[PDB]
């Protein structure tokens, strides 16, 4: 999958080729490619990795992808929701698939 | 350049690899890859090819890209305007460069 990372904190977007099937996350791939957001956490509760995801190409994975915790974090920042509109996720919880994506970090802590 | 075409009239987006430097347009590349919008014109006045363009990667070409005619067509549909926000263009007037793009047709005649 090809992922384009964007952030108010990045002067340029970063285009990354990611191998699906190795249990990678959007945040892990970003850091692995030198896209190191300033704040993160180990329990998926901080919300700092919030991203707006735009579908570019490939199959979307039809399935319940949000744990109760991620849903509660998204609700607490006002972002709880075959056409594919932009969707909000915690990047540290978002599993990389074969889908090509535009991934926009919000930049707030 | 990689271009992702999207339209309310397309069930799936279409990812295209385009060679820059051969005086290609977004509409020409789309048709060349089987993305044939239903309506078009030869004088760039019909407005049917209106697209919303999102920057994905690569250098943006800094230069006056809009003729008076395209500006007037864009104004007539309410779409006249190193950070790169989404911009509206006539796809038949938009020259392909090395920039990777998401290109969304509006779908209206
Ligand atoms: S890095 Fe803390 S919620 Fe994702
Ligand atoms: S195809 Fe008519 S203005 Fe572009
Ligand atoms: Mg940026
Ligand atoms: Mg579509």
UniProtKB/Swiss-Prot annotation, chains A, B:
One of its GO terms (molecular function) is 2 iron, 2 sulfur cluster binding. GO terms for cellular component: cytoplasm. The keyword Transcription does not apply. InterPro entries: 2Fe-2S_ferredoxin-like_sf (IPR036010), 2Fe-2S_ferredoxin-type (IPR001041), 2Fe2S_fd_BS (IPR006058), Beta-grasp_dom_sf (IPR012675). Binds 1 [2Fe-2S] cluster per subunit. Residues 58-86 are annotated as: N-loop. [2Fe-2S] cluster binds at residues 41, 46, 49, 92. It is found in: Cytoplasm. Keywords: 2Fe-2S, Chaperone, Cytoplasm, Iron, Iron-sulfur, Metal-binding, Nitrogen fixation. The keyword Ion transport does not apply. Its main location: cytoplasm. Disruption phenotype: No visible growth phenotype, but shortly after entry into stationary phase the nitrogenase subunitsare destabilized and are no longer detectable. In vitro nitrogenase is highly sensitive to O(2). Its cofactor is [2Fe-2S] cluster. It holds the Pfam family Fer2. Binds to and protects nitrogenase from irreversible exposure to O(2), in what is known as 'conformational protection'. Shifts nitrogenase into an inactive, O(2)-tolerant state. Exists in 2 states, an open oxidized state that binds and protects nitrogenase, and a closed reduced state that probably does not bind nitrogenase; cooperative oxidation of the 2Fe-2S clusters causes the conformation change. Does not protect nitrogenase with the vanadium-iron subunit, not clear if it protects the iron-only nitrogenase. Homodimer. Forms a complex with nitrogenase consisting of 1 MoFe heterotetramer, 1 Fe protein dimer and 1 FeSII dimer; the interaction is electrostatic and disurpted by increasing NaCl levels. Has mobile N-loop (residues 59-96) that changes position in a redox-dependent manner being folded against the protein in the closed reduced state, protecting its [2Fe-2S] cluster, or away from the protein in the open oxidized state. The open form complexes with the MoFe and Fe subunits of nitrogenase protecting them from O(2). This is Protein FeSII. It comes from Azotobacter vinelandii. The gene is fesII.
């Amino acid at each position: 999958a090809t992922i384009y990372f964007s952030s108010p904190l990045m002067p340029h977007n970063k285009k990354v080729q990611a191998v699906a099937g190795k249990r990678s996350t959007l945040l892990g791939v970003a850091q692995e490619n030198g896209v190191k957001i300033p704040f993160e956490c180990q329990d998926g509760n901080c919300g700092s990795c919030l991203v707006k995801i735009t579908h570019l190409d490939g199959e979307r994975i039809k399935g319940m992808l949000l744990t109760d915790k991620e849903r509660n974090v998204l609700k607490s920042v006002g972002k709880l929701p075959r056409d594919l509109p932009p969707t909000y996720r915690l990047a540290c919880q978002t599993i990389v698939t074969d889908e090509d994506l535009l991934v926009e970090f919000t930049g707030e802590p």
